[PDB]
Structures are given as structure tokens and as C-alpha cells.
Design a protein around this ligand. Sequence first.
Ligand SMILES: O=C(O)[C@@H](CF)OP(=O)(O)O
Ligand SMILES: O=C(O)[C@@H](CF)OP(=O)(O)O
Ligand SMILES: O=C(O)[C@@H](CF)OP(=O)(O)O
Ligand SMILES: O=C(O)[C@@H](CF)OP(=O)(O)O
Lengths: 272, 272, 272, 272
Amino acid sequence: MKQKVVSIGDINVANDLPFVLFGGMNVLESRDLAMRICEHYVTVTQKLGIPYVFKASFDKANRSSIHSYRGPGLEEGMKIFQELKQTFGVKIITDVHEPSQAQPVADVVDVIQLPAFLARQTDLVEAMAKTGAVINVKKPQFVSPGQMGNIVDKFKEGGNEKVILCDRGANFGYDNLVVDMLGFSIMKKVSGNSPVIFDVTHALQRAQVAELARAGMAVGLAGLFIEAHPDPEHAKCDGPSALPLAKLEPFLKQMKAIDDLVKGFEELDTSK
Amino acid sequence: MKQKVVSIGDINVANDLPFVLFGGMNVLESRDLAMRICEHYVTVTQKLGIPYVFKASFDKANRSSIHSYRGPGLEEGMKIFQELKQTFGVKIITDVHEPSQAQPVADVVDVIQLPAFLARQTDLVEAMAKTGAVINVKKPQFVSPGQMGNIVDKFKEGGNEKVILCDRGANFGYDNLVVDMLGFSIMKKVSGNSPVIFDVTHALQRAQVAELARAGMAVGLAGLFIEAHPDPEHAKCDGPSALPLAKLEPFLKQMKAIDDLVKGFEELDTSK
Amino acid sequence: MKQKVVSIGDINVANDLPFVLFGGMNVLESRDLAMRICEHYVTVTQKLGIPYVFKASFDKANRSSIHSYRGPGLEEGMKIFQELKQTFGVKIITDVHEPSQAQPVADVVDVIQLPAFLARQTDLVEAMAKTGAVINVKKPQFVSPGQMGNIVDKFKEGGNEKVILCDRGANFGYDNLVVDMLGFSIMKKVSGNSPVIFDVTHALQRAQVAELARAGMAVGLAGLFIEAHPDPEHAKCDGPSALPLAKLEPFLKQMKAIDDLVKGFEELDTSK
Amino acid sequence: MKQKVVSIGDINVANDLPFVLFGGMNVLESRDLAMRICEHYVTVTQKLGIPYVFKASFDKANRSSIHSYRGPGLEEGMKIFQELKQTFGVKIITDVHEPSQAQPVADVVDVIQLPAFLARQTDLVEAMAKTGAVINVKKPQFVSPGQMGNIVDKFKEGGNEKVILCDRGANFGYDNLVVDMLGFSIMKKVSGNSPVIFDVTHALQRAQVAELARAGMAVGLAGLFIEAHPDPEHAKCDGPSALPLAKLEPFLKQMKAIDDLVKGFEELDTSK
Ligand SMILES: O=C(O)[C@@H](CF)OP(=O)(O)O
Ligand SMILES: O=C(O)[C@@H](CF)OP(=O)(O)O
Ligand SMILES: O=C(O)[C@@H](CF)OP(=O)(O)O
Ligand SMILES: O=C(O)[C@@H](CF)OP(=O)(O)O
């Protein structure tokens, strides 16, 4: 069985290809920051030989306070990815929440994400289906990997056949996530062997961001979807768990020294 | 500690008051049906002495097929609750998915629901907050009961202090729900002792609809949120698990013979 | 379908019969205590009209310290149930851990228990099978209710057909138990409809001992297996979670007002 | 922090050292088999440069049938490891169930195992503590990794400070196991940094034996504890899930190409 390809421009995402990193930041605080943060990625990517896609949310449709920072707005956000694209020649993956924001972001970016909590919102998929851009479906915490075909299915109907599946762990009792490594293959299978990527940072809700991402990668993935802040310690609010930027590179060597070593193994079958 | 009250008109919903049944049907197939189905409730309610709120969805924002029946539309749906209200003098609780549908349904109905999968969508809450109608928050499968305060919190800010919490079980491994009876009190506590109701039918994803609803009720609740079809057997698709309409009454005797017996116990403390 | 009966002497344990309480204490600290503790049960039982079986461990084969109190020993323990039997005309259920202790305890007591952690130890079952006494199998935290037939099966072979199944909740993530009410019927079914009892106190690892035991009972059981200490507060170590003795009675009224009300319902079928 | 060492003879087991494989078979069917099966290991081990310990049970204290094959008996079993030791100069790790079998097996073997279901049986630990041999504690399906210190603790008291911790996954709903990769470090920490090994085959209750064991190893372990049969297909009963013997080697290359690559990384800290 050969793997599917959901190429993002000159980028070819696939399960047998070398892992593609969809790094970035969580929310778009300020460009002065977006760029310092993005700055390092591009440098470490190019230097280490790793495909890359910058990622950042231009909105947070979910929080525990409305009187809080919604986000750079759907308008003042797209413009930031603009100055970003040019200045670094990197792709932009950002999530969307309302059907209307679909087509817009499609033009300003390359990869568009479907928020886990919404992976089951027909009205928004049949819409994210129109743009026809690459889609990244975040595997809902509450859904078994074998049920991922239907989402990939529904997208096909919307006339979109360029989808990637992102895993961020599964519910393990109240208030806790565990990542079932066996679920990565289960998703490849039911998704027409679509690209499976591992969202490590929110899979952890740590010093575990590595050991946990080494295990995923030592299984074989189309890539990692990580996040990091220049000074997590002080920004440490809640939602995902960003990586210490300075450790970006030394941590990505861990991956390649694996995403390769494994990505080039003679197909094994411990089955028969 | 006295319980909070989120009265729906002449109806007083509360944890110490007798249980209020929010029965009904799942999706609004056709009025000819809505009414036959609703017909029985009203009869059995009045006859058995049980507060009642008809419930039915006028839309299904989630399915495994877009080429499917979305639903009676936000417009042609509100009109159905119309002929319904008059003809039976019963309240109408229906869920909403997009912020725009908020205020409308508010006028056509009494109780409005926040879809579990969305219990964490600020943009829709701060909006369902404006109408200022009674809200029913479906406890997300993926969220510990102690985290329910924040949703009830956020609503307060939106200027709405009339909320009810509905429990539909918690994730127990891949593809399975279990209802943690201990979670009912945990929710009362963090929600300013708001009305806690038990959504039994989708808590089961059966002959279990009773044994499972007898256990919930034998704990003390502000009410049950059930669903039923006149011929489940043939309609049995997937989503919730409706009750055999003919068994409505004989099954509600089970409850009152409990929602009372228990609702009138001298406060116990096995604590000290 | 009629229920099975595993009568303990003049006691008839069954799923349709009124619940039988297997109360008692955890470990046998000292007779001066065993008796004060047992004292109250017998009084409240007789007075409230509830079958009763005193229960207490004469040993603790599991702890977090060997330099600790193993227990009254298999010898000096049996003697205590002796002065107990006579003085109160109540049955004695105590757990066993090693095959050798099987036949002995069989003579000194009525009901013998198989420790959950060991429900899968053939060598000890084929032995607890010889005595031929009533057996109480504690449902292992780590085993789905539908797998309980095999234990009941294996016992039959050992030539013992008098078994009762006790449920103490299921694993819900790391360090936590939740009791799946739906599992009570699943066990009745696969166990030739054997007596199913609910071990509430260790199902909780509280002020929840009631709300949690009201839910179980409001489902229908052959009985509850509870535990209590005269001053939990100061004895509060760890293992199970005992009930405040003084609250024994007021808490048992909760049950009968349920174990009856429900135990006498006209068989319902929300199935068809 | 440096890792602890629980050397089994000329073998040095540790978390930073290269992984030690505790392969073998499940139950001791017949020597003619034990040896063909063991035969391959030794060959592939020596040839690939991997420490090795043969493993096989001489007994099965747990099954779903007493009229079944208990096992080669504690006596006729020890003798088999005898002809085995000599003929291959490999260590023998076998589990024990009753305190009496402790000291015996200690003499005939090198590494002795404590059966998961019993990891909490003081009476057997304080006994497996006397021999003073290397102990391998199988992490109970039902116990959070952070609670593993106490077992390692209790052993110390029994006067034994040579213990290894084996992980075989955690309960994920009824009838299912998932291996939480993050739990490997949590165990190292609370066990005085004792050797942590990954029991992959029963962690699966497949073609997953590799992808699942690549993830564990790509985290860093003191070794793998695997099992395999020459013709699984026809022996496929139930308990663990053995590996196709012929695939032993090609599968162990997967590991070394990882247990090394990772075992020699410059300590990283994604913490600060
Ligand atoms: O995916 C993300 O990065 C985050 C960011 F908050 O939110 P969501 O839970 O919808 O994925
Ligand atoms: O609540 C309901 O009745 C159902 C009906 F489909 O859907 P949801 O999962 O959003 O609650
Ligand atoms: O059942 C009991 O009462 C207790 C008492 F400690 O232990 P176990 O976990 O074996 O049941
Ligand atoms: O560890 C093993 O190999 C097996 C073999 F059956 O049993 P247990 O569950 O006690 O570990």
C-alpha cells in the first residue's frame, strides 16, 4: 500500500515521505512576536532540512472568559500572515470557526485547520470544503481513531480531497489526555491512507514534549504539529503547552534522527 | 444550602423541587409526527403529575453525510413549535448552533439549549447570553463535571443567570459512554447549585434506558431529558437512543416513584 | 426470566428478592471494636427489616508496608467470628488469600469472599471451590462486567454453584473509579442471573456514599456490601472509605425506601 | 541524574544503558519447543549485539478453565531451564505465584517476576524479597505509574534492592489497553530511577507489535520484554500476543536502530 499525498504547494505531505513540521505559535499576540517566534523556525528548518509550515491562530473561539482576548480578528489577522509570507516564504496554517471565515483565510494561507471541538460540524465542513484548500482535521479528544473516515468522507463530498488528520490524544478519565500510539495506523487505514500528523503540544494539555514526541515519530508520521513560546514560563496560561523556543533546534534533531531512521525501514510485517 | 431556581415560565426547575421532564423527540421529522409524539407526553405528564417541556431539534449541525437531512430549517422549524405551543400549552426547548439563530428561537420558545460539542464556544454563548432566555448546557462528553462552573460563569457575564446543566455521560475508552453518578453533585456545587438534569437517551449513544435512569433519579435531579420515537426499531439510525413511546407512562411512574421518594428525604450527611 | 438464589442459611440472596446488606468493618482491629461496630448493624438491621451479614477482614494481604498490621491472623481471627456468631446470630463473610485458608474459614463462617485482585487465580478458586460454601466474587476494577461469566463458570467446575458477584466500580483513568450502573444487568445476564451486590464503600476508594448507593439500589440489586467505622475521621488511612456508624440507620432507610419501591415494580421493557 | 543498575550477572540493566531484551515464550509447552524458540533468540541476540534474557512461564495461575494446562509444574519446570541454561548460556526469568516457589526458582534462574495481578500481595513480596534475586514487577493494568514507588519501596524492606519495573499498558474503558508513553519517565522518577522495561506483547492483549514497540523504545528504556511463537496463527489462544519468530531479527533491528540512536542523545530539557 502506497500513501496519499496532500501537497501544500511545493510541499508534499505524506505518511512515507519525511515528516513535515507544522510548528508555530498558539494565538497571534503581536507581529513583533509572531516574527521573532517564526524567525527561529525558518532558520532551524532550513538549516536542519525539515519541511515547514508556520502555524498560529488569529482567533480563539474558546476560553473561560469573554472579557478576554478573542484574537487579532479575522481581518487584522490575515494581514499579519501577509507580511509574514513575503518576509519568509513559508506557508500559513490557521484554524477557522465560522463558515464565513472559510474562503477568506483560504486566499491568505496554504493550510486550513478544522478545530477538534468542531470536527463534527457539517455546516462548517461543507463550507471549508468550498475553498478547496488543504484541510487539517484535529482529531477530537472524544472520538476513536477508526471513526475518522467519515470526516474525511464528508470532505470528499464537499468536493475537497486534500485533507490531513491531526492527533492530539484521547480522554483518559476526567481531566487528562493520553496518546494511543496504535491509533496512528488505525487512522491511516480508514482515511484512504491520508497524511497523519501528531499534535504533540496539545496532547499534553512539559519536559515530556520530547519523550512524548519521540514515541509518536518512532512510529512514522507525515509530520508533527508543535507550538512554542520564547518564554513559556511567564506566558503559561492554559490550553496547549508550548515549547521553549531556544530548544527548538536541539529538539528537532531528535525528530529527524528518528523521522528518517524510521521513515526508511524495509516494510515489516509482524502479522504473519 | 438551598438550591437555585431557573423557572421556565410557570415552571420552577430546581434540584430540591420535583423533577421536571424535558421529553420530546430528536429531530423534527414532520409535524404530523411531532404532534403524535408530543401528544402522548402532554397526556402522560398531566395525568401523572410531572412538569413537562417538549423538546425537539429543528436542525442537526452534525452528521456523517451532508447529502442528508439537515433539518426543518431555522425558519420552517420555529413555525412548527408555534402550532405546537398553542395546541398544547407546553414549553419548547430546542438547540441552536450559529449565533444568529439565538434571538429568534428565543421568542418562539422557552428553554434554549447549548450543544455539548459547543459548550466551549464563547462566540455563541456571549450571543445565547443576549436573548437572556433559560439556557440548557449539555455537559460535554470530554469534560470533567468540576469544570462546569466556568461555562455557567461565562453566561453570567453575557448577562444571563438562568442556566441548567445537562449530563449525558463521560468517555470511557474509545466509543463508549458511562455516566458517573457522583458527578451530579459535583456539578450542583460548582454551578452555584444550578439545576442539574440527566440526559439519559444520549448517555446511551436500550432496555437500559430505565435501569440507567432509575439510578440517576435515585440520586436527586432537577429533571430528566429524555427522547422517544413511536417505532424506534425502524427509525434506529444513530445519535441518541429514543424510548418506545408506548412505554412513556409506565416508565415515568418509575421516576416519580423515585424523584419523589428521594426528593423528600431528610438531608443526610454520611460525611461526619 | 427468574433470578438465581444463593441462600446463606436462612438467608435467601437474589436479584428480585429484597436487598441483603453485607455490612461490617474492614479489618479486624479488636473484638472490643468488632462488637461495638457489629452491635449497631444487628440493631438497625432487625429494627428496619433488612437481611444482614456481618463482614470483616481477618487479614490484609495487601498494603504499602510489610512492617504494618497484617491482621488478626487466620487463627486468632476465626475465633473472633466465633464469639461473634453466638452473641448475635449473624453470618460471617470474610475474604481469603491463600488456598490453605479456604476450608478453615468455611467452617467458622457462612459467606466467603474472593479478593478482586485475585478473581483470576485458578489455584485459589479450584480450592475455594472445595469447601463448597457461598462465594462472593469482587469484580476486578480492571475487568468488564461481561467477562464475569467465566469466573462463575470456573467455580461451577470446582463443584461450587453458590456464587454472588460484587461490583466495586471500574478504572476511569489513572487513580480513579467510576461505577457503571449499566454493568449491573450485564453481570446478572452472564452469570446465570446470579446475585449481584454493590460494594459501595470501595467503589469510592465521602458524602457520596449515599447518593452513589442510592443510584445503585435504584437499579435493583441482591444487596449492598458496605463498611463503616465509629470514627472514620481519625481512622481515615486508605483502601476503602467507611461510613459514619451513627449514620448507619438513617442511611439504610434511604435504601429500603428504594430497594423495595423498585424491587416491586411491574417488569418493564423499554426495549421493544 | 544518573540511572540505577540492577545487573543480572554479567548483564547490566539500566535506563541509560543500551536496552536489554527479555524475550522468550509465554508458557512452557515442551522443551523441544522451548529450545527451538529460544534457539532463534540467542542467535539473533549475539548476532545483532543485544543483551538477552530468555523468559517463559512454567505456570499459569490464571485461565478461564481449571480443566486446562496449569503448566510444567514448579518442579518439572525448573529442570527445563536447567538443560536450557547450559546449552545456551542465557539467563532465565520466570514468574512466581505462591510464596513457596520463591527461593527455588531463585536458584534455577537469574531474573524473577512478580505477576501484575499480584504486584500488591505483601505476603508474596516479603517472600520474593528473601531470595534477594533480581525482581521484575509487572505494572498492574489498574495502577497509575506514580504509585510504583511503594512496590519498589516494600521490596527494599524485604531486604531486596534489585528491582526492575515492567509496563504492559493501562485500562482504557472495558476490555482494552493503551500504553501511556509519558508513564515511562513517571516510573523512572518514583522508583529511584530503577530500570524501566516495556512489556509490549501484553500491552496488546498484531501488526502493531512493532509500531507500538518503536514508540516505547523511541522514548528510552532499560529494555523490552517481548514474546513470540513459531506459528502464532495456530496457537492464537488468548492472554498475550506473541511475535512471529521468523520476524524476530528484522524486528530487533528496528529497536537497536532506535534504542541506540536515542540512548545516545545529549540530555535535553524542553522544560525551561
Ligand atoms: O489547535 C490549537 O492550536 C488550539 C489552540 F488554542 O485550539 P483547538 O483546541 O481548537 O485546536
Ligand atoms: O441533544 C440532543 O438531543 C442531540 C440530538 F442529535 O444532539 P447534541 O449531541 O448536540 O446534543
Ligand atoms: O473488600 C474489602 O473489603 C477490602 C478490604 F481491604 O480489600 P479487597 O480490595 O481485596 O476487597
Ligand atoms: O507476563 C506474562 O508473560 C503473562 C503470561 F501469561 O501473564 P501475567 O499477566 O501474570 O504477566
